Amino acid sequence: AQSIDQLIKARGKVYFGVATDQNRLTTGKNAAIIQADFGMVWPENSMHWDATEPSQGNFNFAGADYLVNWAQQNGKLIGGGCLVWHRDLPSWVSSITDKNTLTNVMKNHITTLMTRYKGKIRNWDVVGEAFNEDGSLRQTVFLNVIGEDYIPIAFQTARAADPNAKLYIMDYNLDSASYPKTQAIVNRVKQWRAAGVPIDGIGSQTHLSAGQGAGVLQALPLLASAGTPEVSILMLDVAGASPTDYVNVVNACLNVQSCVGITVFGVADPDSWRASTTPLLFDGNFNPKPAYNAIVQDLQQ
Amino acid sequence: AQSIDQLIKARGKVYFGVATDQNRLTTGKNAAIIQADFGMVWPENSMHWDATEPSQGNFNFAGADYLVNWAQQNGKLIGGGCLVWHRDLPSWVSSITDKNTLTNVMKNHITTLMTRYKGKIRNWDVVGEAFNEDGSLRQTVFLNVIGEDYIPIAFQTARAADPNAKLYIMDYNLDSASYPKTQAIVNRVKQWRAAGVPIDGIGSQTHLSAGQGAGVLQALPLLASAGTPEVSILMLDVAGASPTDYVNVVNACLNVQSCVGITVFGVADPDSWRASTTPLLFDGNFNPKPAYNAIVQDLQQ
């Protein structure tokens, strides 16, 4: 079973990565597969806000520490979870109505996580899921209380905390070039970067249905037209795991110079958040599926 | 699938349980199977010392809180994870050399966790894996620094923290009645209870190879001869998952009045610590295996 990370590096990319966490690495065959076949690990849950700061100032780092240590001991790159988003946000944060307080709470959360792992994390998702489907800004507690400058503030705070990290904005449903959300994030990132905001990358959280891989061949070039140094495919899975869909997504990254790599949202189907759609590259016996072998063949040519 | 928890309750027992945690409940089909078929949940990792007190006096409860909330919402009993053992132990604990200090650290760890969930946890494993295979006490930091009184102190502290909870000592390789460790824990528990130590249960961490189920029919009655109010089988798995092995373990519990129930160490084979031995009751597609149906039939006769 050849390594898709080694093959994608040979094509000039940085990594083929996977989401994982402590109890994945201690069960199944996940550790062995990640050691052999993937070049970068991401925290499935252990760096999100609900996991890391469940009460104000009460930081929970045991899970993230385990992942970072494991990655360093096994020579893997590390991607950092989402620092600022609304999903599963603890109630103590969404209850805050004072602009100064929330600004400092946001800054402290960013700075504390990034400082702890300073120099060890290749890229951080600083802001996630900030856009509505129509392309307007999603009305989260951060937008409602801080205002539109919360995105500039978050990225400026992150850059100061670890200047070595690549700083990403991330969203989903960026999979079609004709979708308003895709066009909107490009336009806003262009305008933020022109004003000096340090957005190094756009990460596309690519959760696809059967047959949607082909659209990424046109969407990813559009995302790259925003002019960020990097773009990436994040937390990829595909209902049905057709080889055609997976190969199309891989070729989209190969076709876009600034695409640095691809991360898949888990190793084996039974550990997927949508396991009934068997959407990953390894089956419930940890055997590589046809999609894995099709990626290998596509990368060899 | 018919519920083995309902069926074991119909035979006069308390529960058929399973180990789980937050990222199991949000992936695969684990939540649906636990809702339908199991009556108790245990924390796979979220209550061990490395997860809950990675620095002195500074506790991490996000993962454990999630599990406790989920269980209460879904009407499930909750078993508490091992409070005092040598596994998953942070280096700050194992570097302590003063008896008074380590005693206070141990008491504070016990009291803090048990107080937080006071009244919500049916069972706590207070001390785990305290015995060598020859029946002598394992030379852990607790034994080396405090001495053999650490076990009485741990149980007396636990009883004061939550008098409602059933307090267990737990160990593995208690699966054969002629094995030295089995008689040794009986000897010591009888002594401790005669000295008024509040040991309510012996929990047998039952990790079996093929064909070893038959021996539990003699070992579990021997464990029960120590006179604790309860015994249980914890974190059960069986290499090969033979119906004969699983049914023999179930019948050992049915044969022992004081055996309150059985907990299996996960739901589906790919999420096992020894997945290559396919040792659990559901396969990698979340289908019940022959051993599951054999338990169903055994409990109905």
Numbering used by the authors:
A (entry chain B), B (entry chain A): 3 to 303
Task: Quote the passages of the study that discuss this structure, keeping the authors' original sentences.
HG3.17 was evolved from HG3, a higher-activity mutant (S265T) of the in silico design HG2 that was engineered post-design to reduce the active-site conformational heterogeneity observed by molecular dynamics analysis of HG25. Over an evolutionary trajectory that yielded the HG3.3b, HG3.7, and HG3.14 intermediates, a total of 17 mutations were introduced into HG3 to produce HG3.17, resulting in a catalytic efficiency increase of approximately three orders of magnitude. To evaluate changes to the HG3 conformational ensemble along its evolutionary trajectory, we solved room-temperature (277 K) X-ray crystal structures of all HG-series Kemp eliminases, both in the presence and absence of bound 6NT.
One of the key active-site mutations occurred at position 50, which was mutated twice during evolution, first from lysine to histidine (HG3 to HG3.3b) and then from histidine to glutamine (HG3.3b to HG3.7), resulting in a novel catalytic residue ideally positioned for stabilizing negative charge buildup on the phenolic oxygen at the transition state. In all enzymes except for HG3.17, the unbound state is never pre-organized for catalysis as both Trp44 and Met237 adopt conformations that would prevent productive binding of 6NT. In addition, the His50 and Gln50 catalytic residues in HG3.3b and HG3.7, respectively, adopt a low-occupancy, catalytically non-productive conformation in the unbound state that cannot interact favorably with 6NT. Increasing rigidity at position 50 is expected when this residue is mutated from a lysine to a histidine (HG3 to HG3.3b), given the lower number of degrees of freedom in the latter amino acid.
